[PDB]
Structures are given as C-alpha cells and as structure tokens.
mmCIF file of C-alpha atoms and ligand atoms in Angstrom:
data_model
loop_
_atom_site.group_PDB
_atom_site.id
_atom_site.type_symbol
_atom_site.label_atom_id
_atom_site.label_comp_id
_atom_site.label_asym_id
_atom_site.label_seq_id
_atom_site.Cartn_x
_atom_site.Cartn_y
_atom_site.Cartn_z
ATOM 1 C CA UNK A 1 5.222 -14.924 17.289
ATOM 2 C CA UNK A 2 5.993 -15.093 13.609
ATOM 3 C CA UNK A 3 5.992 -18.745 12.425
ATOM 4 C CA UNK A 4 9.289 -19.959 10.899
ATOM 5 C CA UNK A 5 9.929 -19.599 7.217
ATOM 6 C CA UNK A 6 11.588 -22.344 5.178
ATOM 7 C CA UNK A 7 15.342 -22.133 5.386
ATOM 8 C CA UNK A 8 15.174 -22.414 1.612
ATOM 9 C CA UNK A 9 14.182 -18.730 1.650
ATOM 10 C CA UNK A 10 16.917 -17.423 3.876
ATOM 11 C CA UNK B 1 1.184 -9.113 -15.620
ATOM 12 C CA UNK B 2 -0.565 -5.726 -15.608
ATOM 13 C CA UNK B 3 -3.003 -6.438 -18.571
ATOM 14 C CA UNK B 4 -5.214 -8.539 -16.432
ATOM 15 C CA UNK B 5 -4.415 -5.959 -13.776
ATOM 16 C CA UNK B 6 -7.014 -5.232 -11.162
ATOM 17 C CA UNK B 7 -9.442 -8.097 -11.930
ATOM 18 C CA UNK B 8 -9.432 -10.462 -8.940
ATOM 19 C CA UNK B 9 -9.611 -14.183 -9.619
ATOM 20 C CA UNK B 10 -12.182 -14.800 -6.818
ATOM 21 C CA UNK B 11 -14.256 -11.686 -7.400
ATOM 22 C CA UNK B 12 -14.195 -9.809 -10.706
ATOM 23 C CA UNK B 13 -13.282 -12.894 -12.756
ATOM 24 C CA UNK B 14 -16.361 -14.845 -11.350
ATOM 25 C CA UNK B 15 -18.605 -11.793 -11.083
ATOM 26 C CA UNK B 16 -18.665 -12.038 -7.267
ATOM 27 C CA UNK B 17 -18.602 -8.819 -5.186
ATOM 28 C CA UNK B 18 -16.731 -8.436 -1.870
ATOM 29 C CA UNK B 19 -18.731 -7.482 1.246
ATOM 30 C CA UNK B 20 -17.938 -3.740 1.140
ATOM 31 C CA UNK B 21 -16.997 -2.753 -2.371
ATOM 32 C CA UNK B 22 -20.503 -1.216 -2.933
ATOM 33 C CA UNK B 23 -19.636 1.422 -0.248
ATOM 34 C CA UNK B 24 -16.841 2.519 -2.652
ATOM 35 C CA UNK B 25 -19.043 2.595 -5.753
ATOM 36 C CA UNK B 26 -21.875 4.370 -3.923
ATOM 37 C CA UNK B 27 -19.372 7.211 -3.133
ATOM 38 C CA UNK B 28 -18.450 7.977 -6.801
ATOM 39 C CA UNK B 29 -21.840 9.637 -6.668
ATOM 40 C CA UNK C 1 -5.502 -0.729 10.537
ATOM 41 C CA UNK C 2 -7.760 0.969 13.080
ATOM 42 C CA UNK C 3 -11.497 0.193 12.987
ATOM 43 C CA UNK C 4 -11.322 -2.055 9.901
ATOM 44 C CA UNK C 5 -12.457 -5.677 9.390
ATOM 45 C CA UNK C 6 -10.772 -8.850 8.445
ATOM 46 C CA UNK C 7 -10.267 -9.087 4.686
ATOM 47 C CA UNK C 8 -12.026 -11.915 2.769
ATOM 48 C CA UNK C 9 -9.758 -14.505 1.175
ATOM 49 C CA UNK C 10 -8.444 -13.221 -2.226
ATOM 50 C CA UNK C 11 -9.969 -9.642 -1.610
ATOM 51 C CA UNK C 12 -6.525 -8.001 -2.012
ATOM 52 C CA UNK C 13 -4.349 -10.258 -4.110
ATOM 53 C CA UNK C 14 -1.820 -7.512 -4.823
ATOM 54 C CA UNK C 15 -1.066 -7.224 -1.034
ATOM 55 C CA UNK C 16 2.552 -7.779 -0.271
ATOM 56 C CA UNK C 17 4.257 -8.268 3.111
ATOM 57 C CA UNK C 18 7.722 -6.695 3.558
ATOM 58 C CA UNK C 19 9.586 -9.164 5.788
ATOM 59 C CA UNK C 20 12.794 -8.903 7.731
ATOM 60 C CA UNK C 21 15.120 -11.937 7.501
ATOM 61 C CA UNK C 22 16.570 -11.493 11.081
ATOM 62 C CA UNK C 23 15.105 -10.701 13.448
ATOM 63 C CA UNK C 24 12.231 -12.094 11.316
ATOM 64 C CA UNK C 25 9.574 -9.445 11.590
ATOM 65 C CA UNK C 26 7.100 -7.489 9.516
ATOM 66 C CA UNK C 27 8.632 -4.308 8.139
ATOM 67 C CA UNK C 28 5.745 -2.790 6.054
ATOM 68 C CA UNK C 29 3.073 -3.525 3.397
ATOM 69 C CA UNK C 30 3.746 -3.225 -0.341
ATOM 70 C CA UNK C 31 1.885 -4.010 -3.560
ATOM 71 C CA UNK C 32 2.357 -6.235 -6.594
ATOM 72 C CA UNK C 33 2.123 -4.253 -9.876
ATOM 73 C CA UNK C 34 3.450 -6.953 -12.303
ATOM 74 C CA UNK C 35 5.065 -10.453 -11.958
ATOM 75 C CA UNK C 36 8.404 -8.957 -11.026
ATOM 76 C CA UNK C 37 7.824 -5.457 -9.484
ATOM 77 C CA UNK C 38 6.603 -4.413 -6.101
ATOM 78 C CA UNK C 39 5.632 -0.899 -4.984
ATOM 79 C CA UNK C 40 6.241 0.462 -1.516
ATOM 80 C CA UNK C 41 7.033 3.655 0.481
ATOM 81 C CA UNK C 42 10.736 4.758 0.307
ATOM 82 C CA UNK C 43 10.661 5.236 4.124
ATOM 83 C CA UNK C 44 10.137 1.477 4.628
ATOM 84 C CA UNK C 45 13.700 1.084 3.279
ATOM 85 C CA UNK C 46 15.487 4.339 4.062
ATOM 86 C CA UNK C 47 14.916 6.645 6.969
ATOM 87 C CA UNK C 48 18.222 8.001 8.325
ATOM 88 C CA UNK C 49 16.791 9.724 11.386
ATOM 89 C CA UNK C 50 15.850 6.265 12.690
ATOM 90 C CA UNK C 51 18.965 4.719 11.367
ATOM 91 C CA UNK C 52 16.907 2.749 8.782
ATOM 92 C CA UNK C 53 18.791 1.758 5.638
ATOM 93 C CA UNK C 54 17.654 -1.692 4.357
ATOM 94 C CA UNK C 55 19.412 -3.437 1.439
ATOM 95 C CA UNK C 56 18.183 -6.264 -0.821
ATOM 96 C CA UNK C 57 19.789 -8.995 1.204
ATOM 97 C CA UNK C 58 18.049 -7.657 4.298
ATOM 98 C CA UNK C 59 14.642 -8.600 3.161
ATOM 99 C CA UNK C 60 12.053 -10.994 1.891
ATOM 100 C CA UNK C 61 8.762 -10.272 0.047
ATOM 101 C CA UNK C 62 5.766 -12.484 0.969
ATOM 102 C CA UNK C 63 2.806 -12.615 -1.506
ATOM 103 C CA UNK C 64 -0.638 -14.239 -1.342
ATOM 104 C CA UNK C 65 -0.853 -13.945 2.406
ATOM 105 C CA UNK C 66 -3.842 -13.743 4.651
ATOM 106 C CA UNK C 67 -2.582 -14.638 8.147
ATOM 107 C CA UNK C 68 -0.064 -12.156 9.627
ATOM 108 C CA UNK C 69 2.139 -14.874 11.264
ATOM 109 C CA UNK C 70 1.834 -18.411 9.821
ATOM 110 C CA UNK C 71 3.891 -19.542 6.840
ATOM 111 C CA UNK C 72 0.819 -20.222 4.524
ATOM 112 C CA UNK C 73 2.204 -23.418 3.221
ATOM 113 C CA UNK C 74 0.722 -23.855 -0.226
ATOM 114 C CA UNK C 75 -0.714 -20.326 -0.718
ATOM 115 C CA UNK C 76 1.985 -17.672 -0.075
ATOM 116 C CA UNK C 77 5.077 -17.339 -2.304
ATOM 117 C CA UNK C 78 8.257 -15.843 -0.794
ATOM 118 C CA UNK C 79 10.705 -13.966 -3.097
ATOM 119 C CA UNK C 80 14.125 -12.340 -2.860
ATOM 120 C CA UNK C 81 14.840 -8.931 -4.301
ATOM 121 C CA UNK C 82 17.076 -8.298 -7.248
ATOM 122 C CA UNK C 83 17.307 -4.533 -6.684
ATOM 123 C CA UNK C 84 15.762 -1.647 -4.796
ATOM 124 C CA UNK C 85 14.980 1.709 -6.450
ATOM 125 C CA UNK C 86 14.175 4.769 -4.376
ATOM 126 C CA UNK C 87 12.861 8.033 -5.922
ATOM 127 C CA UNK C 88 15.924 10.255 -6.408
ATOM 128 C CA UNK C 89 14.092 13.269 -4.843
ATOM 129 C CA UNK C 90 12.524 11.422 -1.899
ATOM 130 C CA UNK C 91 12.559 13.977 1.041
ATOM 131 C CA UNK C 92 13.279 12.204 4.342
ATOM 132 C CA UNK C 93 14.729 15.379 5.778
ATOM 133 C CA UNK C 94 11.554 17.410 6.095
ATOM 134 C CA UNK C 95 8.355 15.801 5.069
ATOM 135 C CA UNK C 96 8.592 12.445 3.256
ATOM 136 C CA UNK C 97 7.860 14.191 -0.084
ATOM 137 C CA UNK C 98 7.967 11.580 -2.898
ATOM 138 C CA UNK C 99 7.785 8.639 -0.461
ATOM 139 C CA UNK C 100 7.996 5.854 -3.092
ATOM 140 C CA UNK C 101 10.204 2.935 -4.010
ATOM 141 C CA UNK C 102 10.187 -0.011 -6.429
ATOM 142 C CA UNK C 103 11.629 -3.480 -5.700
ATOM 143 C CA UNK C 104 12.313 -5.888 -8.577
ATOM 144 C CA UNK C 105 12.049 -9.543 -7.661
ATOM 145 C CA UNK C 106 14.868 -11.989 -8.440
ATOM 146 C CA UNK C 107 12.295 -14.146 -10.225
ATOM 147 C CA UNK C 108 8.848 -13.423 -11.568
ATOM 148 C CA UNK C 109 5.994 -14.727 -9.390
ATOM 149 C CA UNK C 110 3.135 -16.854 -10.685
ATOM 150 C CA UNK C 111 -0.354 -15.572 -10.397
ATOM 151 C CA UNK C 112 -3.024 -17.642 -8.665
ATOM 152 C CA UNK C 113 -6.342 -17.080 -6.972
ATOM 153 C CA UNK C 114 -4.493 -15.201 -4.166
ATOM 154 C CA UNK C 115 -1.771 -13.523 -6.175
ATOM 155 C CA UNK C 116 -2.695 -10.939 -8.793
ATOM 156 C CA UNK C 117 -1.384 -7.416 -9.615
ATOM 157 C CA UNK C 118 -3.213 -4.128 -9.153
ATOM 158 C CA UNK C 119 -3.391 -1.520 -11.999
ATOM 159 C CA UNK C 120 -1.492 1.824 -12.049
ATOM 160 C CA UNK C 121 -3.785 4.778 -12.682
ATOM 161 C CA UNK C 122 -3.730 6.653 -15.982
ATOM 162 C CA UNK C 123 -4.202 10.417 -16.262
ATOM 163 C CA UNK C 124 -7.948 10.006 -16.849
ATOM 164 C CA UNK C 125 -8.561 7.459 -14.131
ATOM 165 C CA UNK C 126 -6.728 9.705 -11.646
ATOM 166 C CA UNK C 127 -8.706 12.641 -12.792
ATOM 167 C CA UNK C 128 -12.135 11.113 -12.204
ATOM 168 C CA UNK C 129 -11.485 9.233 -9.031
ATOM 169 C CA UNK C 130 -9.185 11.324 -6.895
ATOM 170 C CA UNK C 131 -12.004 13.443 -5.654
ATOM 171 C CA UNK C 132 -12.786 14.649 -2.110
ATOM 172 C CA UNK C 133 -15.566 12.445 -0.710
ATOM 173 C CA UNK C 134 -14.710 9.394 -2.956
ATOM 174 C CA UNK C 135 -13.728 6.366 -0.931
ATOM 175 C CA UNK C 136 -10.601 4.245 -1.380
ATOM 176 C CA UNK C 137 -9.586 1.090 0.514
ATOM 177 C CA UNK C 138 -6.483 0.516 2.641
ATOM 178 C CA UNK C 139 -5.192 -2.880 3.760
ATOM 179 C CA UNK C 140 -2.374 -4.092 6.025
ATOM 180 C CA UNK C 141 -1.451 -6.130 9.090
ATOM 181 C CA UNK C 142 -0.587 -3.034 11.233
ATOM 182 C CA UNK C 143 -1.722 -2.137 14.683
ATOM 183 C CA UNK C 144 -5.387 -2.160 15.519
ATOM 184 C CA UNK C 145 -4.896 0.670 17.984
ATOM 185 C CA UNK C 146 -2.685 3.686 18.325
ATOM 186 C CA UNK C 147 -1.293 2.509 21.673
ATOM 187 C CA UNK C 148 -2.894 -5.022 19.223
ATOM 188 C CA UNK C 149 -2.067 -6.914 16.058
ATOM 189 C CA UNK C 150 -4.640 -8.608 13.880
ATOM 190 C CA UNK C 151 -4.456 -12.399 13.157
ATOM 191 C CA UNK C 152 -5.444 -11.689 9.522
ATOM 192 C CA UNK C 153 -5.195 -8.941 6.910
ATOM 193 C CA UNK C 154 -7.472 -5.990 7.802
ATOM 194 C CA UNK C 155 -9.285 -3.572 5.383
ATOM 195 C CA UNK C 156 -10.947 -0.099 5.879
ATOM 196 C CA UNK C 157 -12.738 2.116 3.232
ATOM 197 C CA UNK C 158 -11.977 5.869 3.853
ATOM 198 C CA UNK C 159 -12.982 9.061 2.060
ATOM 199 C CA UNK C 160 -10.461 11.330 0.315
ATOM 200 C CA UNK C 161 -10.413 14.735 2.067
ATOM 201 C CA UNK C 162 -10.143 18.246 0.485
ATOM 202 C CA UNK C 163 -6.527 19.588 0.279
ATOM 203 C CA UNK C 164 -7.253 22.580 2.654
ATOM 204 C CA UNK C 165 -8.664 20.375 5.410
ATOM 205 C CA UNK C 166 -5.529 18.181 4.990
ATOM 206 C CA UNK C 167 -3.194 21.220 5.261
ATOM 207 C CA UNK C 168 -4.945 22.743 8.273
ATOM 208 C CA UNK C 169 -4.903 19.527 10.348
ATOM 209 C CA UNK C 170 -1.127 19.575 10.667
ATOM 210 C CA UNK C 171 2.083 21.558 11.082
ATOM 211 C CA UNK C 172 3.934 19.537 8.374
ATOM 212 C CA UNK C 173 4.241 21.175 4.928
ATOM 213 C CA UNK C 174 2.017 19.006 2.568
ATOM 214 C CA UNK C 175 3.164 18.790 -1.131
ATOM 215 C CA UNK C 176 1.315 17.982 -4.342
ATOM 216 C CA UNK C 177 2.944 14.434 -4.100
ATOM 217 C CA UNK C 178 0.529 13.652 -1.248
ATOM 218 C CA UNK C 179 -3.141 13.394 -0.449
ATOM 219 C CA UNK C 180 -4.917 12.736 2.935
ATOM 220 C CA UNK C 181 -7.892 10.508 3.694
ATOM 221 C CA UNK C 182 -10.187 9.714 6.634
ATOM 222 C CA UNK C 183 -13.495 10.720 8.131
ATOM 223 C CA UNK C 184 -14.084 14.119 9.799
ATOM 224 C CA UNK C 185 -14.866 14.330 13.528
ATOM 225 C CA UNK C 186 -18.542 15.023 12.845
ATOM 226 C CA UNK C 187 -18.691 12.333 10.191
ATOM 227 C CA UNK C 188 -19.129 9.645 12.833
ATOM 228 C CA UNK C 189 -17.163 6.770 11.276
ATOM 229 C CA UNK C 190 -13.537 6.050 12.040
ATOM 230 C CA UNK C 191 -10.568 4.145 10.708
ATOM 231 C CA UNK C 192 -6.974 4.795 9.631
ATOM 232 C CA UNK C 193 -3.774 2.916 8.670
ATOM 233 C CA UNK C 194 -1.554 2.556 11.827
ATOM 234 C CA UNK C 195 1.953 1.373 12.540
ATOM 235 C CA UNK C 196 2.807 -1.729 10.444
ATOM 236 C CA UNK C 197 0.651 -0.506 7.494
ATOM 237 C CA UNK C 198 3.267 1.739 5.873
ATOM 238 C CA UNK C 199 4.112 0.996 2.231
ATOM 239 C CA UNK C 200 0.698 -0.648 1.664
ATOM 240 C CA UNK C 201 -1.884 0.292 -0.978
ATOM 241 C CA UNK C 202 -4.737 2.788 -1.024
ATOM 242 C CA UNK C 203 -6.874 1.505 -4.005
ATOM 243 C CA UNK C 204 -9.977 2.497 -5.780
ATOM 244 C CA UNK C 205 -12.281 0.472 -8.051
ATOM 245 C CA UNK C 206 -13.097 2.114 -11.366
ATOM 246 C CA UNK C 207 -16.817 2.396 -12.117
ATOM 247 C CA UNK C 208 -15.894 2.589 -15.906
ATOM 248 C CA UNK C 209 -13.878 -0.618 -16.461
ATOM 249 C CA UNK C 210 -14.329 -2.075 -12.935
ATOM 250 C CA UNK C 211 -10.712 -2.795 -12.332
ATOM 251 C CA UNK C 212 -8.809 -1.878 -9.144
ATOM 252 C CA UNK C 213 -6.304 0.879 -9.266
ATOM 253 C CA UNK C 214 -3.663 1.846 -6.708
ATOM 254 C CA UNK C 215 -3.974 5.657 -6.076
ATOM 255 C CA UNK C 216 -1.791 5.952 -2.912
ATOM 256 C CA UNK C 217 0.778 4.377 -0.642
ATOM 257 C CA UNK C 218 0.387 4.472 3.220
ATOM 258 C CA UNK C 219 2.873 7.172 4.090
ATOM 259 C CA UNK C 220 2.589 9.053 7.417
ATOM 260 C CA UNK C 221 0.140 10.265 10.036
ATOM 261 C CA UNK C 222 0.205 11.596 13.629
ATOM 262 C CA UNK C 223 -1.196 8.981 15.977
ATOM 263 C CA UNK C 224 -3.810 6.636 14.420
ATOM 264 C CA UNK C 225 -7.560 7.292 14.179
ATOM 265 C CA UNK C 226 -7.321 10.568 16.106
ATOM 266 C CA UNK C 227 -10.071 13.193 15.752
ATOM 267 C CA UNK C 228 -9.254 15.955 13.353
ATOM 268 C CA UNK C 229 -6.171 14.133 12.106
ATOM 269 C CA UNK C 230 -5.865 12.280 8.717
ATOM 270 C CA UNK C 231 -3.513 9.662 7.196
ATOM 271 C CA UNK C 232 -1.277 10.854 4.361
ATOM 272 C CA UNK C 233 -0.439 8.819 1.268
ATOM 273 C CA UNK C 234 1.998 9.155 -1.637
ATOM 274 C CA UNK C 235 0.117 10.278 -4.770
ATOM 275 C CA UNK C 236 0.902 7.414 -7.153
ATOM 276 C CA UNK C 237 -0.217 9.095 -10.388
ATOM 277 C CA UNK C 238 2.026 12.124 -9.876
ATOM 278 C CA UNK C 239 5.053 9.858 -9.587
ATOM 279 C CA UNK C 240 3.945 7.552 -12.465
ATOM 280 C CA UNK C 241 6.581 8.943 -14.837
ATOM 281 C CA UNK C 242 9.461 7.956 -12.554
ATOM 282 C CA UNK C 243 7.781 4.484 -12.173
ATOM 283 C CA UNK C 244 7.407 4.028 -15.963
ATOM 284 C CA UNK C 245 10.918 5.229 -16.322
ATOM 285 C CA UNK C 246 12.607 2.735 -13.985
ATOM 286 C CA UNK C 247 10.676 -0.199 -15.454
ATOM 287 C CA UNK C 248 11.498 0.752 -19.035
ATOM 288 C CA UNK C 249 15.190 1.181 -18.114
ATOM 289 C CA UNK C 250 15.729 -1.615 -15.623
ATOM 290 C CA UNK C 251 13.512 -4.568 -16.073
ATOM 291 C CA UNK C 252 10.091 -5.786 -17.101
HETATM 292 C C1 1ZV D 301 4.485 3.280 9.004
HETATM 293 O O1 1ZV D 301 3.946 2.169 9.608
HETATM 294 C C2 1ZV D 301 6.069 3.271 9.322
HETATM 295 O O2 1ZV D 301 6.254 3.350 8.127
HETATM 296 N N1 1ZV D 301 7.401 3.245 9.977
HETATM 297 C C3 1ZV D 301 7.407 3.438 11.427
HETATM 298 C C4 1ZV D 301 7.075 4.823 11.997
HETATM 299 C C5 1ZV D 301 6.317 5.124 13.308
HETATM 300 C C6 1ZV D 301 6.973 6.083 14.365
HETATM 301 C C7 1ZV D 301 6.116 7.125 15.170
HETATM 302 C C8 1ZV D 301 6.653 8.557 15.332
HETATM 303 C C9 1ZV D 301 6.131 9.920 14.902
HETATM 304 C C10 1ZV D 301 6.458 10.527 13.620
HETATM 305 O O3 1ZV D 301 7.532 11.145 13.387
HETATM 306 N N2 1ZV D 301 5.535 10.320 12.649
HETATM 307 C C11 1ZV D 301 5.683 10.783 11.201
HETATM 308 C C12 1ZV D 301 4.648 11.917 11.356
HETATM 309 C C13 1ZV D 301 5.004 13.170 10.673
HETATM 310 C C14 1ZV D 301 6.310 13.400 9.968
HETATM 311 C C15 1ZV D 301 7.523 13.578 10.590
HETATM 312 C C16 1ZV D 301 8.684 13.812 9.851
HETATM 313 C C17 1ZV D 301 8.677 13.892 8.519
HETATM 314 C C18 1ZV D 301 7.498 13.732 7.836
HETATM 315 C C19 1ZV D 301 6.365 13.460 8.588
HETATM 316 C C20 1ZV D 301 5.530 9.537 10.371
HETATM 317 O O4 1ZV D 301 4.390 9.070 10.317
HETATM 318 N N3 1ZV D 301 6.563 8.982 9.812
HETATM 319 C C21 1ZV D 301 7.950 9.395 9.938
HETATM 320 C C22 1ZV D 301 8.723 8.370 9.136
HETATM 321 C C23 1ZV D 301 7.778 7.379 8.541
HETATM 322 C C24 1ZV D 301 6.388 7.766 8.956
HETATM 323 C C25 1ZV D 301 5.600 6.648 9.610
HETATM 324 O O5 1ZV D 301 5.741 6.525 10.846
HETATM 325 N N4 1ZV D 301 4.757 5.865 8.911
HETATM 326 C C26 1ZV D 301 3.999 4.718 9.376
HETATM 327 C C27 1ZV D 301 2.539 4.804 8.967
HETATM 328 C C28 1ZV D 301 1.682 5.675 9.802
HETATM 329 C C29 1ZV D 301 0.308 5.833 9.258
HETATM 330 N N5 1ZV D 301 -0.430 6.568 10.241
HETATM 331 C C30 1ZV D 301 -1.609 7.051 10.159
HETATM 332 N N6 1ZV D 301 -2.232 6.826 8.961
HETATM 333 N N7 1ZV D 301 -2.278 7.664 11.143
#
C-alpha cells in the first residue's frame, strides 16, 4: 500500500 | 554535515522542546 | 515500534528509510550521519540464513520522511547508493556480533528542516550516557504489535538495562558490541522496536552540549514488547574506529 515513487528514482 | 550534528532545525535551533525529550533528561539523574 | 507515539514533524531528521526498488517495500530504518553517509545494521543487507544479500542497485534511501507510505512530494529526498560497507567481522553465523554497515550516497543530500544528521558519540559522551537507567529514544515505521503498521513514524523512550539482566534474559551469547534496553516487568511501562525497525537509531540527548547522539542501532530481539525480554542494539561507540576508518579511506 506503498505509494508509487517517481520513475526518476528507479 | 556533522558539525551542526544533532541540533534539529525545528527544535534545538529555535529553542523549542519536543513533547517527550524531558523524560530523557530527567533520567540522566 | 510497540507502545510508542507518533513522532512530531522534524523530531528525528536523521531518520532514514531503507527502501526496496521491487517489490517496492520497506526493508529497515537507518540514520543520516553526514550529507553522504548513512548508518544501518549489517543484517538489513546481508543475512545468509534468510537468503538476504542486498546490493547497491537493489535499494533506495528515503530521507525527511514522516508518513510510512506516501511519496512526500516536496519534503522527502530519495537517493541511490554509491557503495555498501559491512563490518569485516560482522557475525551472522551465531549472534549478529558487530551488526553495522555504512552506505555512501551517490550524491550528497541537502539539509532542510526535515533532513539533518545525528552526531556520533565520542569516548566521553559514551562514558557518561551509556548508563543503566538512562533513557534513549528509538524510532521507526515497524510493527505496532508482535503479531499493524503505523501511518507515521513512531517513537518510544526506553531505559538502558544492566549487562547481567541483559545476559540472563536470553540464551544467545551477548558480546561487548551490544547493549539491551527496555523496561522490566515490574517497571510497568512498555515499548520496544519490532519488525520493520531494524537498522534504525537509538539516540540520546547530551545534557552537556544538548546535541543528539546515536548510541545504538536496532539489532535483534525475541518477540516484541514481551515481559522479561529486551531489545538488543549494536554499540555504536565500540565500532566507531571502523566507522572513522571507512570514511577516512573511502569518502567524505
Ligand atoms: C529487524 O526488523 C529485521 O531486521 N529483519 C527481520 C527479522 C525478523 C524475523 C523473526 C525471527 C526470529 C529470530 O531469529 N530473531 C533474531 C533473534 C535472536 C537471534 C538469532 C540468531 C542470531 C542472533 C540473534 C533476530 O532478531 N534477528 C535475526 C536476524 C536479524 C534479527 C531481526 O529479526 N531483527 C529485527 C528487529 C527486531 C527487534 N526486536 C525487538 N527489539 N524485540
């Protein structure tokens, strides 16, 4: 239920 | 940045205390 | 954290979340000791019995967080790791002796109201504060109960317990690289670190210069908030030389 992190971090 | 280490911007730096830090200090007899 | 309270905004600005890239999930707590170095438990990265062996690419560090789950859009800063350093004598085989690791960020983080490093104890600071009966503070987003998860960062103040009492509460062989904390069954107050809190900081506030110091790392326990049991923590000052060492040789 973790909210999505910005792809820029992946 | 350890130099300014352990002084919180919203507490130490403004001379504000958090809700339970006195329980800590009152234990260091 | 078991029997804690929600932390106030900016109460623990050195609090770090260890975050798995995929599945995205919370791994452990950690702490910010400078603009490029993070301190955590070696077990958060390497624990062969459980097939745990995380690499740099496997993870993200999240700093300035409050909420466990939301991406805190202009507050938290996410970083990638440049390199992981585990204590060469970490003992995963028997007792988690020397449970400590350093992580150097790819790029130095900027300090803010919610992002600020904790101090590393000196010989003298260690000597006056690491006393049975003296309270330290633990923080993390771990389980609220042994058996769920907080919405926000939790905190609990707990007393350091005498070495004998620590030793006699368990079957595991305790080393000088560890200390235990918690209230005694008669003491009538509770609280402990619980699953999800590992690698986080045990800190104390100096009464001499009134700065926060990190004395321990959440390391191991048996259950959470059980009577006659205590949480164990890596003794940060005892491993200070290895810490100093790696920073002098590899970064800063
Ligand atoms: C921390 O959140 C975690 O770091 N990683 C997940 C581990 C939870 C699994 C539960 C299983 C039991 C167990 O083996 N617990 C040990 C207890 C004693 C021990 C065994 C072997 C060697 C040394 C010690 C244990 O706690 N751990 C084994 C590996 C890592 C560690 C651990 O589970 N840490 C937890 C934090 C727990 C804090 N608990 C507490 N303060 N009551």
